[PDB]
């Protein structure tokens, strides 16, 4: 009624202490202020708005926020991007992200969807007004989404054009299956309670075959491309980890196994997710590098051939971090009431 959908310059707000030199906390010292000890969330009358998580501006604001952080904190000895290369230095730090709250300025208010099972698109009854986002960790992943929020009710599957195979699929789970990756040459590994992994994959298929008119859903390994979208990629406390899922996508097992062990590797030269380019980073020291994250949703891409056959094949996707921000920012929308 009185408000208008619009885009603005949202201001951040961590909790990071300046006593910690871990780059997150150091980056969070400026640009962003403290958290709300009593943040307000006012239930909007009893009307219902209509959101869209594929055309939000918070996503591109937060995409740029995190880009500065990475090229200000994790600076590559040499960063080569279309057009030119920039020679720098490579220090050794640690990476445990801080939950960040996003906050609209003077006049503007954040509209939020608390509708039980929402797919970030259209009708949204239970709407509300807040000044900040919520505790979201800015973790850069691929294939699986880690250290994030989980669905309250049923499992949510959601994209822009479900039917289109170019539109990336976001799988938001209802249970957080733990994972554990460690580096004890560079080769490291991971391990997953496959007993909960393939049992909570079962319901990811069942819900996925409710939008494809009870068809057949089969999972498969990535068709190919760049190593960061083939191999589940992330940054464990400083080094870039590429872990081969596969054994986690080889359809089947849904008494087969218990513990899964994806191999994995650590790369020092890698294609940037900031721009079309690549940059060499720094080796590590024997730190027994270990990340124990919460897998909480996956990035899948469908194949071309729906009507043809009685089945659909899905594969691990990603590459566009923007979708990584989209999975948590799916409920809020910027509004200007000035």
């Amino acid at each position, epitope marked *: 009624p009185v408000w208008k959908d619009a885009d603005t*310059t*949202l*201001f951040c*707000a961590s909790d990071a202490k300046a006593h910690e030199t871990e780059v997150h906390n150091v980056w969070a*010292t*400026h*640009a*962003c*202020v*403290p*958290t*709300d*000890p*009593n*943040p*307000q*969330e*006012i239930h909007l009358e009893n009307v219902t708005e209509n959101f869209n998580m594929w055309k939000n501006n918070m996503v591109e604001q937060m995409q740029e926020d995190v880009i500065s952080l990475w090229d200000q904190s994790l600076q590559p000895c040499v960063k080569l991007t279309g057009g030119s290369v920039i020679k720098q230095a490579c220090p050794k730090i640690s990476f445990d992200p801080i939950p960040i709250h996003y*906050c*609209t*300025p*003077a*006049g*503007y*208010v954040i509209l939020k969807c608390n509708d039980k099972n929402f797919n970030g698109t259209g009708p949204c009854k239970n709407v509300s*007004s*807040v*000044q900040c986002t919520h505790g979201i960790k800015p973790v850069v992943s691929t294939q699986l989404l880690l250290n994030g929020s989980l669905a309250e009710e049923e499992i949510i599957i959601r994209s822009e054009n479900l039917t289109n195979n170019a539109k990336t699929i976001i799988v938001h789970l209802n249970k957080s299956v733990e994972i554990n990756c460690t580096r004890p040459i560079r080769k490291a590994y991971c391990e997953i309670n496959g007993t909960k992994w393939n049992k909570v994959l079962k319901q990811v298929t069942e819900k996925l075959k409710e939008h494809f008119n009870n068809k057949t859903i089969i999972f498969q390994p990535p068709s190919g491309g760049d190593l960061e979208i083939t191999m589940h990629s992330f940054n464990c406390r400083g080094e870039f980890f590429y872990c081969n899922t596969t054994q986690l996508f080889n359809n089947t097992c849904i008494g087969c196994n218990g513990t899964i062990t994806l191999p994995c590797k650590i790369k020092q030269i890698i294609n940037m997710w900031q721009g079309t380019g690549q940059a060499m980073y720094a080796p590590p020291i024997d730190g027994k590098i270990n990340c124990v994250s919460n897998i909480t949703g996956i990035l899948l891409t469908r194949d071309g051939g729906a009507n043809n056959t009685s089945n659909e094949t899905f594969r691990p996707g990603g590459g566009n971090i923007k979708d990584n921000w989209r999975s948590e920012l799916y409920k809020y929308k910027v509004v200007q*009431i*000035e």
Partner: antibody
Amino acid sequence: QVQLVQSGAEVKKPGASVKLSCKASGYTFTSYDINWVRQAPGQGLEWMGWMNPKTGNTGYAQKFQGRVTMTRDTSTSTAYMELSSLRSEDTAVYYCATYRIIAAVGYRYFQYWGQGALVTVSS
Amino acid sequence: AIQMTQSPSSLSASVGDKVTITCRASQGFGNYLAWYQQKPGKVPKLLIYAATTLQSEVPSRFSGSGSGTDFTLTISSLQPEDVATYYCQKYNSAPFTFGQGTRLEIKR
């Protein structure tokens, strides 16, 4: 018609504590927060703490971290703010305040100030 | 962080003069900058809110400028009714910190 009135002034001996009173009217005292701020004669403004009236969550400042203690009784629709271990540098005008009564957010400036209470700390 | 520093503590200013009271900070809080005025011996009342938006029933000689890290409160055509100290404050979220203060003169 939004009224936020205080009571009289107070004289207390060092280390005896004083409970300041605040009564608000003409709005939903349970909705909007209540802030407390003071001004020592020859002083500027110093914000003390905030309090959520429907669920008494309380936050204060580091400087006043520990002595301050805001409470409320919705039955009475009156806010409170004790200040124990009373030093005589803690003698100034203590006021309650609140914001623009709107069901919207971001409007958390103090638009309704109280009359003021003089807390004189001496024997 | 957040370090609000009101420029001057006291000023001269004829009558029907232009006075610019500056308010700076450490890190921006998204322009939710408030301007309060304390008339001597009175309780203070809100002037400008959200950086520039004037409050109802208040003279338009008061203008809230600046934004982000460097705000200003300007009064052109100063008069004897416009005297107290004007304190700048932040209200995005508690802690609702005020500035030191700024008291106005009259030159004479």
